[PDB]
Amino acid sequence: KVEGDIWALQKDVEDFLSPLLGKTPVTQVNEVTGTLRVKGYFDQQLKAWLLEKGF
Amino acid sequence: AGSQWRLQQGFAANPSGYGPLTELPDWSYADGRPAPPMKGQLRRKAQREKFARRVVLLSQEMDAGLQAWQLRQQEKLQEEEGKQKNALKSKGAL
Amino acid sequence: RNRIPGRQWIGKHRRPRPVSAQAKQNMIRRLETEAENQYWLSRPFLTAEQERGHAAVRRAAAFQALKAAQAARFPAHRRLEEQLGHLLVTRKWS
């Protein structure tokens, strides 16, 4: 459920996840679905992030 | 045939390989304009460069290896004297 | 009027076939190549001691490359331009 420039979101998600992983995380962007896929379980840490940003 | 003679003389076994024949840009314009470069030449320049790069890499790594070993030995011989430098004086005497 | 019982080259009776001067030439040529081979195979530059871990730095990195290469595999990004781009089938010239 993402409405907007999803690449904008992927920049931020990647940049936020990188210092934790040590490497830039693998991603699949879907513009038609409005969907982002990220490799591994980051669920817990992503909730906390999308709360901060207020989404 | 006669690759043997060619080898003794220092040329290529196959007159195709690397001789003056294959290297030169066979066709040019009337005006004298240089031709668009050939594909056989191009990829060969690429791979010859790969070969050179790797000769340099290996030679350098071998010299670095030998340097490292010598260094390690000199350090060892130096630790042997560090032993003398640290030791306590024996007060046992006859 | 002369037969070679059974199959020509298989059994306990075979076709007699003789060795030829050509074959001797070839065999000896190949030997000479091998002799020259082990001459050059005889004398190492570094000793066995000296060559220890001389590149463990590169050989770690090569494997990191081999790992990253697989880490990178995921289903590719799907973009807006293709789905809507398909609509171009019905383009009308009026």
Q: State the residue for tokens 């080898």.
A: B7
Pairwise CA distance, residues B18 & C29, whole Å: 26
Distances (CA, A) of A31 to A17, A28, B83: 21, 10, 70
Spatial separation of the C-alpha atoms in residues B27 and B31, rounded to whole Å: 12
Q: Are A28 and C76 inside 8 Å of each other by CB?
A: yes
C-chain CB neighbours of A26 within 8 Å are 71-74
| Residue whose tokens read 């007699």 | C16
* Domain total in chain B: 1
For β-strands A35-38 and A27-30, DSSP reports them as antiparallel
> Which run of H or E residues covers position B8?
helix B3-9
Q: Answer yes or no: are the C-beta atoms of A12 and C58 closer than 8 Å.
A: no
Q: Are the CB atoms for A48 and A17 separated by under 8 Å?
A: no
Residues 6+ apart with CB under 8 A from C78: A28, A29, A30, A31, A32, A33
Nearest to A32 among C73, C76, C78 (CB): C78
Residue C13 is encoded by which pair of tokens?
């009776």
Q: Is B45 helix (H, G, I), strand (E, B) or coil?
A: helix
- For C15-22, which contacts have Cβ atoms below 8 Å and span 24 or more sequence positions? none
Full domain range(s) for residue B75: 1-94
Task: Report C:56-85 residues touching A (Cβ under 8 A).
Answer: 71-80, 83
The tokens of A21 are what?
């992983």
CB contact under 8 A, C75 and A37: yes
DSSP state of B3: H
Structure solved using which method? cryo-EM
Task: Read off the amino acid at residue C59.
Answer: R
- State the sign of the Cα–Cα–Cα–Cα dihedral A9, A12, A15, A21: negative
Token digits for C54?
A: 């001389």
Considering only CA atoms, which of B54, B42, B31, B93 is closest in space to residue C58?
B54
**Among chain C residues, CA nearest to A25:** C72
Resolution expressed in Å: 3.4
